[PDB]
Structure 1
Amino acid sequence: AETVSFNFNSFSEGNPAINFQGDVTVLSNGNIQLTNLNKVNSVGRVLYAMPVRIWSSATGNVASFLTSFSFEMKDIKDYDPADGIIFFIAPEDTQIPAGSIGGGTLGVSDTKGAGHFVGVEFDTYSNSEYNDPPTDHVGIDVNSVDSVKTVPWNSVSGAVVKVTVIYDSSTKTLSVAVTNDNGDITTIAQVVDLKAKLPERVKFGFSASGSLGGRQIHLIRSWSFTSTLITT
């Protein structure tokens, strides 16, 4: 049993266990602020520094995992509160796309909206170019920000959201339970075959992005995670 687990109640610039990319920043309170409010097309991403072996080519066994995190998206004048956050899974060599425009790409794809990754996105801006629902939403993404599936949701400015994700290898099911400010849960599940979509080794993390007129605070407050790959 090859297992990976950790728990962050706060963060601090300096911990080698974390990989910072782009305009990421660690506030004084311990929170991670993914984007810069004075930059255009800002993009910041945080990843667990250590790669996770989600599946073996030898045994063909895929790992299952449980994870929970919490974030916040406070509005600021006078920009459009966009574009949101996305928890994602990518190859360990992953970097912010070359010449990223941020915006509706959430920092994980090119302009077309494609890229190499898997993710649960929290959209606060309806990008019609990526077939985005009309209202805020939660989506399951696979190599594209044009979600394979999405569900209506609402991002309350200054609210702290609680999220729980469960991946079951046996069924390739990716479950997401989102708990809003008002104690109401929201959920979206989807069968995503990770062994088919990503390499044996990957990195998990968070990405947020903005643009010219679309900007907002993107805070990642906590994150606990555990993954287990059977080796027998």
Structure 2
Amino acid sequence: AETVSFNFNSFSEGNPAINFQGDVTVLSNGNIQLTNLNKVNSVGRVLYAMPVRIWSSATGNVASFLTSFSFEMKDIKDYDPADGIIFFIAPEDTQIPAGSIGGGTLGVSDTKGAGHFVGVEFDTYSNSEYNDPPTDHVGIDVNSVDSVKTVPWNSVSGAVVKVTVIYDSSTKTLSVAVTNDNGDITTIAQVVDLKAKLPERVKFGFSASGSLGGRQIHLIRSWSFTSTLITT
């Protein structure tokens, strides 16, 4: 089988294994801070530098993957705690949308909320322009921040959240488990055909953004990943 795996317990600029885009910054504690609290419509994204082959045009096989990461969002006096973080998968040449307004676009979509990507968002502000639920929520996005499906969630300021994601190639099911600070878990799952939505080689990463009045701390603390593609 074709397996790719990595595990970061701390990050650092200068590490060739990671690409940085936008206002991203690496704190002295190894944490990744995606947005710049002093910029309007800030957008920051981080990606595993090496593209991963999720499916094969030769065999038609699609990869299965297991990934978990931990992040932290915290309020700052005195802006609206927004907009959130999104774990995404996109073409290997993915870039921050030209003329990105950040905000509710989470740094992956245009003003209409469209883009080429599949992801799991941890959304902390309700943008009616993208049909968001009225509360904080976790959502599965397929080429749009107008989530295909969402589940109520609660973003606790300063709390460390743990996430586990499993993609089963056979059933094409993407299931997500979010462990909150207080111990409660939140789950959401959706059938998503990566073969039909994305190219053979993609990049995995995290993105976050803010607006003029919407800003908050977006930190990525750790990230382990393993994908296995059966080549037969």
TM normalised by structure 1 equals 1.00
Q: Over aligned residues, Cα RMSD in angstroms? A: 0.3
Deviations along 1:10-48, one digit per CA (max 9) or x if unpaired, are: 001110000000000000100000000000100000000
Displacement of 1:78 after TM fit? 1.0
SS at match of 2:99: coil
Shift of 1:155: 0.3
Please state how far the C-alpha of 1:141 moved relative to its aligned partner: 0.2
The separation in 2 between residues aligned to 1:39 and 1:91, in whole angstroms, is 27
1:144-168 CA-to-partner distances (Å, cap 9, x unmatched) read 0000000000000000000000000
How many pairs were matched up?
232
How far is 1:50 from its partner? 0.1
Which SS does the other structure have where 2:36 is aligned? coil
Alignment partner of 1:13: what SS?
coil
What is the distance in 1 between the residues matched to 2:179 and 2:230?
Answer: 31
| 1:68 partnered with 2:65 | no
- For 1:68-106, what per-residue CA distance to the aligned partner results, in whole angstroms no more than 9, with x for missing partners? 000000100111010000000000000000000000010
TM-superposition CA deviations, 1:118-139 (whole Å, max 9, x none): 0000000000000000000000
Question: How far apart, CA to CA, are the structure 1 residues paired with 2:96 and 2:229?
Answer: 28
Q: 2:3 and 2:160 mapped to 1: Cα distance?
A: 29
**What is the TM-score of this pair, normalised by structure 2?**
1.00
Counterpart-to-counterpart distance in 2, 1:193 and 1:131: 23
Q: Matches of 2:203 and 2:111 in 1, distance apart?
A: 22
Taking the aligned partners of 2:136 and 2:192, their CA distance within structure 1 comes to 23
Structure 1 distance, partners of 2:121, 2:162, is 14
Measured in 1, the distance between the counterparts of 2:228 and 2:103 equals 34
**Matched-pair identity in %:** 100
Return the alpha-carbon distance in structure 1 between the equivalents of residues 227 and 55 of structure 2. 11
For the residues of structure 1 that align with 2:198 and 2:25, how far apart are their CA atoms? 28
Q: CA deviation at 1:182?
A: 0.3
**Partners of 1:196 and 1:20 in 2: how far apart?**
27
Deviation of the 1:178 alpha carbon? 0.1
| Structure 1 unmatched runs, 5+ | none
Residue in 2 that maps onto 1:158? 158
**5+ residue gaps in structure 2?**
none
User: Aligned with 1:142: secondary structure?
Assistant: strand
Aligned to 2:98: 98
Q: Is residue 2:209 matched to residue 1:230?
A: no
Separation in 2 of the partners of 1:217 and 1:38? 11
1:117 deviates by: 0.2
Partners of 1:94 and 1:123 lie apart in 2 by: 21
SS at 1:139's partner residue?
strand
Matched with 2:193 is 193
Whole-Å separation in 2 of the counterparts to 1:3 and 1:44: 28
